[PDB]
Amino acid sequence: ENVWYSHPRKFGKGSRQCRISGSHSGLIRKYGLNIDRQSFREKANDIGFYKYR
Amino acid sequence: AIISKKRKLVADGVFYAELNEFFTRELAEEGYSGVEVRVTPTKTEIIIRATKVQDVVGENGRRINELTLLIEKRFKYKRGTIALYAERVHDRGLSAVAQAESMKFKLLNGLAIRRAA
Amino acid sequence: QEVVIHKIRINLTSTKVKQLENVSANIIKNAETFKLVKKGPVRLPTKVLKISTRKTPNGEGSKTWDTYEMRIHKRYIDLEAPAHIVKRITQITIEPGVDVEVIIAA
Amino acid sequence: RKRSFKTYSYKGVDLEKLLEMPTEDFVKLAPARVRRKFARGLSEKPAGLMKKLRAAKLSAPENEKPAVVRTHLRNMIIVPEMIGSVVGVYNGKVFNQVEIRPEMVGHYLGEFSITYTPVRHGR
Amino acid sequence: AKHAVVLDQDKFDRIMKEAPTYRYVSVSVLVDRFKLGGSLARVALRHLENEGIIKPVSKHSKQAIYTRAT
Amino acid sequence: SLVVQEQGSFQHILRLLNTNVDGNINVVYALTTIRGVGRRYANLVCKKADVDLHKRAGELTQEELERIVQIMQNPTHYKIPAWFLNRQKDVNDGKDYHSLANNLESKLRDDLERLKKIRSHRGIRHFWGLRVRGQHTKTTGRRRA
Amino acid sequence: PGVSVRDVPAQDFINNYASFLQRQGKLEVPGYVDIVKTSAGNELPPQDSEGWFYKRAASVARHIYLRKQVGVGKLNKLYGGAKNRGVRPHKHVDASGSINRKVLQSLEKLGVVEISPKGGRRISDNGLRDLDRIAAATLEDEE
RNA sequence: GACGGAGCCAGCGAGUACAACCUUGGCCGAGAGGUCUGGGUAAUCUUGUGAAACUCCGUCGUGCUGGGGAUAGAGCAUUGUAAUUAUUGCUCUUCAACGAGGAAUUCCUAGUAAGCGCAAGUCAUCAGCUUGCGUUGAUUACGUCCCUGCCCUUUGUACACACC
Ligand SMILES: [Mg+2]
Ligand SMILES: [Mg+2]
Ligand SMILES: [Mg+2]
Ligand SMILES: [Mg+2]
Ligand SMILES: [Mg+2]
């Protein structure tokens, strides 16, 4: 309810939240995924991502 | 609605993953295993597989409807555009996820671990 | 009484290639049975979506890297047809996994 | 005597003109950074601090210093509207005292404060 | 600087004298014989290249080779 | 295209603007030996004078030299845009200033003194004998001034 | 038979063009000539001061003749290259933006270059004729 | 070789509508850039990503020099509320250490080494970094346990928390 409780957080690592943990650490923004990489490297198989080469 | 095709596909995949995770979390008692998404024009079918299908169903439109509503809320789509079906899995023994869930349940209640395995 | 040629593009995008191919084949068969002038199941540069990552959760090991790739298959099916026939075709012609999309008009 | 040493000028303008020009003129006769800052949206930068400075100037014992005006906005630019006043520039600990001279023209507030200690052992 | 890249009349005269009955007429060779610079050598060659005397073999940049008239 | 002849009409080894201009160098890159005098700037000056870029530094007519000197002093009087200068729009005087020969150093010294007087971060760094443009010295340059 | 235009070994053609331009005296000099780096990756302008800009113009014209709808950005890209970045490795930065534009304008004025639809530039018919003549001259010089 | 010219060639890429993308093309700016119109939710437009390295002619010819651009002052921009502790950018300048690197040792057996860029990852802004991709493109093995590390056998062991 306080008047001043937000910084101008338009960009940077702050505004950029993860889709699972909400981390600001190692965020694959690419393709509009927005995931912290570690989690992706576990869920990727369901996200349709595979490794071949 | 409508983005770059690649991007769209990626988003769909992500959505699927999210849904799967939710079902693992929400339908834990329900003995859930897999989700089978079918996206057609208007009516998007979502098939869900579980051991305890009755629980998922409820008493005719109980939990399933709630889940549908939740899904709608999550992803902006309206009533009727998302349909949910709960099915029997054809022999759970081959299915790893189901087995894992069963094992977990056995562990949590109070039983011999090695013997259970 | 109608029969006004619009020229209609059908998009076929997906990952699981076999299914896509089957769908394409089915569409072509259907076109044959309704007998129309049509350009084939034109294939585009199958876009790979690469996401390369440190395999390590935490950056303490050898520098192992994995390229997680997403194969995508974009197909154009061009029809010399009115809209009604296209609608008729798209009543069925849907198989799981594959994206059916109608662009419509030239 | 007619000229005192050499005229401490911005871009060819004397102190008789410097003290009375307001901000726009300073910006016009300034480095690009200041101009850029002026161009972008101003709010709470010259709001209360300026007023405080003015008050200090008014309530000064004459010939002596005005009251030390404390600033958190150390990213502020020094404009000739307040030459003579002392500014207390914040560093995390202690608002540190800075003179405003006829040669601090269009420079920053931060560049006269410094947070960390200068290096020891050997120069 | 190592000198011998001046101008003069004497030098020119010497150059004029040092042209017939030689196996090589090259820029590098000229430089070696303690004469004018790389660009100047070419100019000198050009001045002698009016009515026979010195004839080219290669036309490439900074790798030019000329030979006497046979 | 042609070798410059004659017995000795033009004198070798020059001394222009408080410093030394060594011969055997083609026009421009002997003027770079002068402290502060440009490359592009030098070329521009030459153009203004009206000299060919085939002559030696150990030549030049006296009139030409005078012209060059004149060009050097004022960028504004001749057709020079003059934003290729050490002091453009300036820190104090507010004109067009491209200092010459043994004066640039003096100007620099004066500027340094001014900085010291002001007591800016840069000035402090200079006093210390360290690194101005936010360059770090955790690793690099372990002898220093 | 047939008098060819593309069949000229590049540099000779350009030289011929330059010579023609010199002979005519009709181009209208940009004004910022020699007071310019020409490329963003330059420490020196053209070496021969006067001229060389003519050569550049000629080259541009030749390129235009060769291709379809050609613009300023593409020209810039063409006449860019490698930057001496000191401690940092080279990048690729393009040529000076205005100079190329000015050159194009000058060409348009003379009647070598014409404005094309869709976005770019092509060759004027008189310009084409001139180019052909130049090519013929070059061939004659060779033959 | 260096600098101008001039020639002129890829492959991976990725890129916005509910927004602040990739952004052509044209006038003004020496740059940096801006602006009016776009085209592209993408083999279709940026894009033949007209990339660099490379190839021709002239100028200077083995000088801490035009090799090298390092410590530095000055303006204009741009990013972002916010740039001083130059974010970065280009322009004029200053123009130093360094004349093929001591002891050690890293990497490599073919489109491989090395060179040379580009793209993506980052990302409001930044590349010298990583992933990738092309672009030029060889020397010398095609072996052996001498050194280094491992491996198995045979041996001995009073160790088995195992020679720390
Ligand atoms: Mg180099
Ligand atoms: Mg392409
Ligand atoms: Mg030097
Ligand atoms: Mg990095
Ligand atoms: Mg024994």
Domain span including residue E5? 1-70
* Listed residue (E26, E31, E27) closest to E3, CA to CA: E31
Which of E1, E3, E7 is opposite residue F3, by nearest beta carbon?
E7
CA atoms within 13 A on the CB side of F113: 6
Q: What tokens were used for G11? A: 């540099």
Indicate the residue type of B47: I
- Clarify whether residues F53 and F91 are in a common domain: no
CB C27 within 8 Å of CB C89 = yes
Q: What does the alpha-carbon distance between residue C33 and residue C37 come to, in Å, rounded to a whole number?
A: 12
Which residues make beta-bridge pairs with F122?
Answer: none
Do both F99 and F69 map to the same domain?
no
Q: Which residues contact C57 (CB under 8 A, 6 or more apart)?
A: A38, A41
End-to-end CA, chain F: 49
Q: For strand H, give the nucleotides within 7 A of a protein CB.
A: 1-8, 12-18, 24-33, 38, 41-44, 46-48, 50-53, 56-63, 65-66, 68-87, 89-95, 116-118, 120-125, 127-128, 130-132
Alpha-carbon dihedral G121, G125, G129, G134, rounded to 10 degrees: -10
- Using CA coordinates, name the residue in chain F closest to G36: F40
Same domain, F75 and F87: no
B2 touches strand H (CB under 7 A): yes
Which amino acid makes up residue F2?
L
Q: Which residues pair with D108 in a beta bridge?
A: D77
Q: How many CB atoms lie under 10 A from the CB of residue F73?
A: 11
Assess F44–G contact: CB distance below 8 Å, yes or no: yes
Query: For chain A, which residues lie within 8 Å of any Cβ of chain B, measuring from their own Cβ?
Result: 19, 31-33, 35, 43, 46-49
Dist CA A48 CA C50 (whole Å): 12
Cβ distance E7 to F1 less than 8 Å, yes or no, reads no
Cα C53 from Cα C71, distance rounded (Å): 17
Interatomic CA distance for residues E20 and E16, integer angstroms: 9
Is F120's CB within 8 Å of D11's CB?
no
For residue D47, CA distances in Å to D42, D60, D70 come to: 9, 21, 13
Residues F50 and F19 in one domain: yes
Who contacts D102 (Cβ-Cβ below 8 Å, separation ≥6)?
Answer: D8, D15, D18, D83
CA separation for the pair D73, C98 (Å, rounded): 58
> Which amino acid appears at position D12 of this protein?
G
| Local structure of B16: helix, strand or coil | helix
| CB atoms F118 and D101 under 8 Å | yes
CB atoms under 10 Å from CB of C12, counted, come to: 21
What are the DSSP E strand ranges found in B1-117? Answer: 32-39, 44-50, 82-88
Q: How far apart are CA G98 and CA G101, in angstroms?
A: 5
At C47, the amino acid letter reads K
Other residues' Cβ atoms within 10 Å of the Cβ of residue F54? 11
- What single letter denotes the amino acid at residue E43? V
Q: Which nucleotide is nearest to F41 (CA to C1')?
A: H92
* G71 C-alpha to ligand 2 centroid (Å): 18
Nearest 5°: CA angle at B101, between B55 and B20? 75
Residue count of chain E: 70
What is the C-alpha separation between E18 and E25, in angstroms, rounded? 10
Distance CA B9, CA C69 (A): 13
Strands (E), chain F: 87-88, 96-97
Residue D65 is classified by DSSP as: P
Q: Which residue has the tokens 């001046």?
A: E6
Nearest CA distance, B38 vs chain C (angstrom): 6
Reduced to 3 states, what is the DSSP secondary structure of residue B49? strand
How many Å apart are CA F32 and CA D46, to the nearest integer?
48
CATH code for the domain in which residue E49 is found: 1.10.10.10
The continuous run of DSSP H or E covering G123 comes out as strand G120-123
HSE toward the beta carbon, residue B17, CA cutoff 13 A: 21
- DSSP letters along C47-76, please? -EEEEEEESSSSS-SS--EEEEEEE-EEEE
Positive or negative torsion for Cα D99, D73, D44, D76: positive
Residue nearest to nucleotide H40 (CA to C1'): B4
Which residues, at least 6 apart from D85, have a Cβ–Cβ distance to it below 8 Å?
A: D53, D56, D57, D65, D66, D67, D69, D100
F43 chain-G contacts, CB cut-off 8 A: 34, 44-45, 49
Tally of domains in chain C: 1
Residue D108 φ/ψ region, left for φ over 0, alpha for ψ in the -120 to 50 degree band, beta for the rest = beta
Domain coverage including residue C36: 1-106
Long-range contacts of A27-36 (CB under 8 A, 24+ apart): A28/C51, A28/C53, A30/C51, A31/B6, A31/B7, A31/B10, A31/C49, A31/C51, A32/B3, A32/B7, A32/B10, A32/B11, A33/B10, A33/B14, A33/C51, A35/B14
Residue G81: both structure tokens together: 């290259």
Q: D24 to each of D55, D81, F94, how far by Cα in Å?
A: 22, 11, 18
What CA–CA distance (Å, rounded) separates D97 from D90? 9
* A49 vs C54, C57, C70: nearest CB: C70
Q: How many CB atoms lie within 10 A of CB A45?
A: 13
Distance CA F139, CA E39 (A): 46
Instruction: Determine the distance in angstroms separating the CA of D3 from the nearest CA of chain F, rounded to an integer.
Output: 15
User: Residue F100 C-alpha to ligand 3 middle, in angstroms?
Assistant: 17
The residue length of chain D stands at: 123
Q: Which residues contact G73 (CB under 8 A, 6 or more apart)?
A: G94
Print burial letters for G9-29: b (CB count within 10 Å at least 16), e (below 16). eeeebbebbbebbeeeeebee
Instruction: CATH number of the domain at C99, please.
Output: 3.30.70.600
Using CB atoms, which residue from F1, F5, F22 is nearest to E7? F5
Q: Is C74 an 8 Å CB contact of chain B?
A: yes
Resolution in A: 3.8
3-state secondary structure of B86: strand
Distance CA D47, CA B36 (A): 61
Pairing assessment for the beta strands B82-88 and B44-50 based on DSSP bridges: parallel
Q: Name every residue whose Cβ is closer than 8 Å to that of residue F97 and which is 6 or more positions away in sequence.
A: F85, F86, F87, F88, F90
Q: Report which of A50, A47, A51, A53 is spatially closest to residue A19, judged by C-alpha positions.
A: A47
Chain D interface test: which of F121, F126, F130, F136 (most D C-beta within 10 Å): F121
In the block, tokens 């090519």 appear at G135
Closest CA to C85 of C23, C25, C38: C38
CB B72, CB B45: distance < 8 Å: no
- List b or e across D4-38, with b for residues whose CB sees 16 or more CB atoms inside 10 angstroms: eeeebbbbebeeeebeebebebbbebbeeebeebb
Taking each helix axis as running N to C, give the angle between helix F121-128 and helix F104-118, from 0 to 180 degrees, rounded to the nearest 10: 110
Provide the shortest C-alpha distance from residue F87 to chain E (in Å). 35
For the CA atoms of F81, F86, F89, F91, the dihedral, rounded to the nearest 10 degrees, stands at -170
Which of D119, D107, D110 is CA-nearest to residue D92? D110
Tokens of G103: 């050159």
Q: What is the DSSP string of C3-46?
A: -----EEEEEEES-HHHHHHHHHHHHHHHHHTT-EEEEEEE---
**In whole angstroms, what is the distance from residue F120 CA to residue F115 CA?**
6
**Cβ-proximal residues to A46 (8 Å cutoff; 6+ apart), any chain:** B13, B16, B17, B20
User: Per CA to C1' distance, which residue is closest to H27?
Assistant: G101
**Length of chain A in terms of residues written:** 53
Q: What is the domain partition of chain A in residue ranges? A: 1-53
Burial status of residue F57 (CB atoms within 10 A of its CB: 0-12, 13-18, 19 or more): buried
What backbone torsions phi and psi does residue F57 show, to the nearest 5 degrees?
-70, -30
Q: How many CA atoms lie within 13 A of C92 on its CB side?
A: 6
* Residue of D118, D96, D75, D90 lying closest to F126 (CA atoms): D118
SS3 content of chain D, % helix, strand, coil (to 5): 30, 10, 60
Using a 7 Å CB cutoff, list residues 11-30 of F near strand H. 24-26, 28-29
**Tally: H helices and E strands in chain B:** 5, 3
Taking the CA of residue B115 and the nearest CA in chain C, the distance in Å comes to: 34
What ranges in chain G are assigned the alpha helix state H? Answer: 11-24, 53-66, 72-78, 97-110, 125-142
Domain A1-53 of CATH type 3.40.190.10: no
Please tell me what DSSP assigns to residue F143.
S
User: CA-to-CA distance for E43 and F41, rounded, in angstroms?
Assistant: 29
Nearest alpha carbon to residue B87 among B61, B52, B63: B52
Is D79 in contact with D95 (CB distance < 8 Å)?
no
C-alpha G140/C-alpha G143 separation (Å) is: 5
C47 touches A at CB < 8 Å: no
Would you tell me which CATH number, out of the four given (3.30.300.20, 1.20.120.1200, 3.30.360.10, 3.20.20.70), belongs to the domain B1-90? 3.30.300.20
Decide: CB of A50 under 7 A of nucleic strand H.
no
* G137-to-D71, G5, G132, G143 alpha-carbon distances in Å: 77, 10, 9, 10
Residue A45: what are its φ and ψ, rounded to 5°? -55, -35
Measured distance CA(B33)–CA(G17) in Å, rounded: 78
User: Counting beta carbons within 10 angstroms of the beta carbon of residue D66, is it exposed (0 to 12), middle (13 to 18) or buried (19 or more)?
Assistant: buried
Name D residues 62-91 whose Cβ lies under 7 Å from strand H. 74-75
Name the amino acid, one letter, at G112. V
Residue D33 CA to H8 C1' — how many Å? Answer: 42
Residue G84 annotated as binding? yes
Quick one: residue G127, left, alpha or beta (phi over 0 = left, psi -120 to 50 = alpha)? Answer: alpha
How far apart CA F85 and CA F72 sit, in angstroms, is 11
Cβ count near D85 (within 10 Å): 20
F65 and F97 inside one domain: no
CA angle in degrees (0–180, nearest 5) for G72-G75-G81:
135
Return the half-sphere exposure (C-beta side, CA atoms, 13 A cut-off) of residue D73: 13
d(Cα G130, Cα G61) in Å, to the nearest integer?
Answer: 11
CA nearest to E28, candidates E63, E67, E3, E68: E63
Q: Round to whole Å and give the CA distance between D34 and D44.
A: 16
Neighbouring residues of G29: CB distance < 8 A, sequence distance ≥ 6: G53
Classify each residue of C78-92 as buried b or exposed e, where b means 16 or more C-beta atoms within 10 Å of its C-beta. bbebbeebbeebbee
Q: Identity (one letter) of the amino acid at D113?
A: S
